[PDB]
């Protein structure tokens, strides 16, 4: 699967152009057309994915049935959203639903590529080759023979007890994988709160180029269910009510901004959450302020969508002239 | 020139590569962005007035607590009668801006054909 | 050199012994050589001088993968180090293309395959994970006016690299104009500038003129001064020829930027500078004399500044890695013809042999790791000469 | 206002996020930080008097070598007789602090009917 960028423009060949915001209409139109292609696509990958479990060497093999209802749960909540099972949602989300779905996408690709290295065969069965090797097919006169493959479509290739190369824990990691992608895909999963609940926050954490179980857990999601079951390692640390998040759980000793205040090394980037819903002027200070209290770098800028606008300005050269002509 | 460029989301056509990863990199600059009109504003907190969906932030703290702030700031949120503005998304760009030593332009013409 | 680093920091940790010989040691074992007398026994070493040292099949350790992965590296070793893998002789031009691409700091085999090597027979055999899964027809690089890449409309998180090919050869306009409409197409962030290689006298091909606001005040406040001295003193005045020749060359122009650089200075004099060669004051009291001498000399500051040798002492750092990090710069590099075909209707063979040797040529790259651009409306304007 | 602006170690209430990593990275700025006086440097520079601390150098030159230096270089640096001021600590910046230079911004002429 693969998700298509904002501003993508139906072309020949197709292009990427934000000069076509030109007010707010134009901004809703330009996240449906894509999430109803990122959606799609979810559709058409999703359902398939028992094909990566052998039948005959995994010991956990999924139910296909599982990821049948996507289609018509994320077509709901997309119209619901849009269009102001039937809920009731804020349209200023739909900026946070498109990043939603590309999470999705994130999560598969940690599965997919994790259990592509598994070999288990917890239970042999004796009676396959019982006294007889087959080798390949016979190639042609005179060609070279095939030395990068592992795989041979007709050779009995060689298979080994869960034991060596490390897969006894692999064979723990995708099922706790499997499972999240289980979790993510539910009904309330995405759960805003009233923004007016919701106090500004700026958590640091790693970039997108991280694997989905090292980044910060997004705000947007349904944390007293999902903050268990987010990464393996940290599970068997033990360290699973840590991790960098919006909340914490009760009754754990926790403090406030711990991540904050002691130093910060593994660190690249910063997620600022809380602001959408409010004022203008308000959330700028709020953020500028923020930014002076805990010491942190970048700057902030605030603009207007629409084509209308409804000054003056201090210049030092222009002053120094106009001081020696009245 | 300063009535335009600053103001408008068609400040991208002099800065490309505007990006929305929910945060700024260490470094970078983050961009809100607005709209104006106070019935428009009404219609879009439409949704924060229903009772069934506020009632999601007792269900989220039994188990969860939020962060605290100034009782002020909470005061001030809450007063959604006059409104004429709303923040409606984010963007990333990775770079800050230099700020001085004014910019003299350098102009090139095309060659000529044959 | 880094596809070699890459086979050998590879095959460092390599144990197979496919075929063990049951005659080396059958019955007894060797232990090291004994330390002298209360030292210390050696415990972080693993492989130590005539010790009996332990070997095993291919099947542990996972070494049943890198069996095959340094037998891939080393063929793709052979097959970089052939006469047809760098097939840019004789050189040609290509459209323009962007592509992302990893950092120089991963491996070889993870970032993008550059433009001159013989690709048609270098995509297979350039990564071998991709060859397991089985896409290796989609890794990026060039092949397979401009050229519309792909990829750029899905989204590019683990990429942080452009890569800028087909720009080489051309003349130094149309690159600058083709290279922004394709970042202004696809939504890209870096900033673009150009240099010269020479000396500051070789700027005789055009005319240099610009309009700086900080003395637009200026030219106003002497322009009318000089007039109204022109209604006071016109008798004696509208006699002189210097003073007249002086009125309708200069004062009499709306605006500064209409007068050029060579019009400001004597040219015999700056010719005899090179070996190679061989009542006024009423408009001194009034700054009509210093004026001018200001306008030349922020002129040249800003014209010597266009120099490889001169921009490099300002902004030490420029290396050449084929195009630009997300958010830096790119630097273009570009010579006269005159430096390049040094010894290769007869009018119009003599007018295209002068002409093609004032071109500007655009022969090499640099980047930078950092853009510095911020709305001052300040410029200076280059115009080619007519031969 | 650059009397105050570009001197006091309260220059990041104008640009926060300085650090101390020992260094700096590529592209990015180095801050000097140091404090001034007679009675403080002669107090400090105390430690570098005592040939027990001298010793440190003859000691250590056993077995490892010191990079190359111009022999007036070390010359003048061992004085310590009359110095006003002294180099204290050090910080990073993640950015360009630029000066000394106006910008170009390189661009094409407008299509002007002819």
């Not at chain 1, 209290?293 to 002239?321: E, H, M, P, W």
């Not at chain 2, 600059?29 to 007792?58: H, I, M």
């Amino acid at each position: 699967p693969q998700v298509r960028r904002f501003g993508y423009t139906l072309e020949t060949p197709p292009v990427i152009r934000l000069s076509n915001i030109v007010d707010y209409d134009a901004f809703l139109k330009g996240y449906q057309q894509v999430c109803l292609q990122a959606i799609d696509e979810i559709d058409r990958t999703f359902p398939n994915l028992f094909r990566l479990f052998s039948p005959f060497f995994s010991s956990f093999n999924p139910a296909p049935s599982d990821f049948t209802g996507l289609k018509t749960l994320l077509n709901q909540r997309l119209s619901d959203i849009v269009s102001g099972i039937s809920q009731i949602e804020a349209q200023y989300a739909l900026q946070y639903f498109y990043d939603y779905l590309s999470q999705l996408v994130s999560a598969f690709r940690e599965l997919a590529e994790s259990a592509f290295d598994l070999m288990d065969d917890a239970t042999p069965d004796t009676r396959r080759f019982p006294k007889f090797l087959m080798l390949g097919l016979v190639p042609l006169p005179n060609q070279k023979p095939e030395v990068y493959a592992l795989n041979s479509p007709y050779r009995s290739n060689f298979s080994q007890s869960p034991i060596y190369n490390g897969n006894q824990l692999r064979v723990k990691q995708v099922r706790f994988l499997y499972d999240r992608l289980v979790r993510l895909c539910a009904a309330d999963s995405f759960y805003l709160l009233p923004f007016y609940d919701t106090p500004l926050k700026i958590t640091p954490s790693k970039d997108r180029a991280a694997t989905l179980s090292q980044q910060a857990i997004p705000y947007y999601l349904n944390y007293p269910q999902l903050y268990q079951y987010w990464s393996y390692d940290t599970y068997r640390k033990g360290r699973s009510q840590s991790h960098p998040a919006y909340f914490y759980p009760n009754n754990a000793n926790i403090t406030p901004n711990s991540d904050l205040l002691h130093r910060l090394d593994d660190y690249s980037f910063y997620r600022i959450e809380g602001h959408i819903g409010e004022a203008n002027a308000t959330a700028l200070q709020r953020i500028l302020d923020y930014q002076q209290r805990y010491n942190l770098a970048f700057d902030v800028i605030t603009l207007k969508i629409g084509n209308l606008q409804s000054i003056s300005g201090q210049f030092d050269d222009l002053n120094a002239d106009f001081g020696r002509i009245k | 020139q300063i009535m335009e460029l600053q103001l408008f989301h068609k400040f991208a056509q002099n800065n490309p590569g505007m990006e929305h990863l929910g945060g700024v990199p260490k470094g970078g600059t983050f961009v809100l962005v607005y709209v104006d009109g106070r019935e428009l504003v009404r219609n879009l907190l439409s949704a924060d007035r229903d009772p069934t969906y506020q009632a999601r932030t007792e269900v989220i703290k039994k188990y969860a607590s939020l962060p605290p702030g100034s009782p002020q700031e909470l005061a001030t949120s809450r007063e959604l009668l006059n409104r004429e503005d709303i923040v409606v998304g984010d963007f990333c760009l990775p770079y800050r801006f230099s700020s001085k030593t004014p910019t003299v332009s350098y102009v090139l013409t095309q060659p000529r054909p044959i | 050199v880094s596809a070699f680093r890459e086979l050998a920091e590879s095959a460092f940790d390599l144990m197979d012994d496919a075929t063990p010989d049951t005659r080396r040691f059958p019955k007894f074992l060797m232990l090291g050589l004994v330390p002298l007398p209360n030292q210390k026994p050696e415990v972080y070493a693993l492989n130590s001088p005539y010790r009996s040292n332990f070997s095993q099949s291919p099947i542990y350790n996972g070494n049943q993968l890198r069996v095959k992965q340094v037998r891939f590296l080393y063929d793709r070793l052979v097959r970089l180090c052939a006469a047809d893998s760098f097939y840019l002789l004789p050189f040609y031009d290509t459209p323009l293309k962007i592509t992302p691409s990893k950092d120089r700091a991963a491996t070889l085999s993870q970032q993008a395959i550059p433009y001159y090597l013989n690709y048609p027979q270098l995509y297979q055999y350039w990564s071998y994970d991709t060859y397991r899964k089985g896409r290796s027809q989609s890794h990026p690089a060039y092949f397979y006016n401009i050229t519309p890449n792909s990829d750029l409309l899905h989204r590019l998180d683990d990429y942080s690299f452009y890569r800028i090919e087909g720009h080489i050869g051309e003349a130094n306009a149309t690159a600058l104009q083709r290279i922004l409409d394709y970042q202004q197409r696809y939504n890209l962030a870096f900033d673009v500038i150009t240099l010269k290689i020479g000396n500051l006298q070789s700027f005789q091909d055009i005319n240099i003129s610009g309009q700086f606001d900080d003395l637009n005040a200026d030219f106003g406040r002497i322009k009318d001064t000089f007039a109204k001295l022109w209604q006071r003193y016109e008798e004696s005045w509208s006699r002189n020829v210097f003073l007249y020749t002086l009125k309708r060359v200069f004062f009499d122009k709306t605006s500064l930027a209409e007068i050029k650089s060579d019009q400001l200075f004597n040219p015999i004099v700056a010719r005899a500078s090179v070996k190679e060669a061989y009542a006024a004051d009423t408009l001194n009291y009034f700054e009509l004399k210093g004026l001018m001498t200001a306008y030349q000399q922020r002129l040249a500051q800003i014209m010597e500044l266009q120099l490889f040798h001169k921009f490099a002492q300002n902004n030490p750092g420029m290396e050449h890695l084929g195009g630009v990090p997300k958010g830096g710069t790119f630097v273009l590099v570009y010579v006269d013809g005159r430096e390049l075909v040094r010894n290769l209707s007869p009018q119009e063979l003599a007018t295209s042999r002068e002409l093609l040797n004032r071109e500007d040529i655009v022969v090499g790259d640099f980047c930078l790791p950092y853009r510095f651009s911020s709305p001052t409306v300040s410029y200076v304007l280059t115009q080619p000469r007519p031969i």
